[PDB]
């Protein structure tokens, strides 16, 4: 009795009615730029899974304007090449999705430029591999920038005409990620790596376990499986997803709802507000690959049931409708950060995460 497609469209319409800036071809200029890339990913993936083309013109407008040389990083020369490798990775993966939706080689070319850009800050001389997130400072090799890069090369290994070195780079990047220690003893991924002051060796910095660091890695392993047909990549991804679903690890509540570690203290900032939807979209990618890899009709119900359970909870406890007026007839739905808690306000990162959950159920 729940239409995930219609609810995703209502959430996207609510995102546009409250946060889209037509004069800037961007959502919420007061919010981080990379979250506009996540929002573009959610709108693109909605069209891919639902077969709709309703926001195609808007998405093209955002791409055309935001691919220009960024005013805060002109040396990147545009094409989403920014002052941080994870900022670039979010838009790069959005262009991979835009290529999947349209088949236009232009978007694939952007992702190829982004891969070569991010690779510039991969070094073997610290932590035996991995890339830095802070382009200007080069002091932090974290989980999200390396998960985004890994999913990028793995995606290009399935789509780019020169798929050989992208597969070799993806296999080498996953080998480094697995051996880095960021995947801890319960198969969850901490924020990044610290460096020994004397030996130069790198180790898990034990910073918080964020949901989107348990998600992007799943899509990377799904793409690695599609490029190799090796179910070992799916089994590693399933181990990470199963750790998130286990309530003993604190990411899944007693009611079975995905819960960011900052929701209890009500301290989720603009970045953390978008994390949950990114995991949900990537979990749906894993559930699809798992169901298609085995003849069992029971392949991956837990992931589908999890996404469905979280969807109903967000529908009932986290929803709020915009008030239509005599002048503005825009209709849709707004959402807060907690998928079980009350609706206090709606922000663009909160809304983008919302769309990701509905799209993950399409
Ligand atoms: Na190490």
Numbering used by the authors: 78 to 439
Text lifted from the article:
CtGH76 crystals belong to space group P3121 with unit-cell parameters of a = 106.8, b = 106.8, c = 126.9 Å, α = β= 90°, and γ = 120° and one molecule per asymmetric symmetry unit. Accordingly, CtGH76 shares the same DD-motif, D163/D164 (black dashed box), in its active site as BcGH76 from Bacillus circulans TN-31 (D124/D125) and CtDfg5 (D134/D135). For Bt3792, the GH76 enzyme from Bacteroides thetaiotaomicron VPI-5482T, these two neighboring aspartate residues were shown to participate in substrate hydrolysis via a retention mechanism. Furthermore, the active site and the canyon-like glycan binding site of CtGH76 is lined with seven aromatic amino acids (W110, W111, W149, Y217, W287, Y289, F352) that potentially interact with the substrate, within an otherwise mostly negatively charged canyon. The tertiary structure of CtGH76 is stabilized by two disulfide bridges (blue dashed box), C204–C279 and C339–C345. C204 anchors the loop connecting helices α5 and α6 via its disulfide bridge to β-sheet β1, whereas the second disulfide bridge, C339–C345, is situated within the loop connecting helices α9 and α10. CtGH76 features two wing-like β-hairpins protruding between helices α7 and α8 (β1/2, D268-R283, designated as WR1) and between helices α11 and α12 (β3/4, R396-D413, WR2). Only WR1 apparently elongates the glycan-binding canyon for providing additional sites of interactions with longer substrates. Otherwise, the CtGH76 resembles other structurally known members of the GH76 family. Compared to the fungal CtDfg5 paralog, CtGH76 exhibits an r.m.s.d. of 1.31 Å over 299 aligned Cα atoms and includes an additional short α-helix (α13).
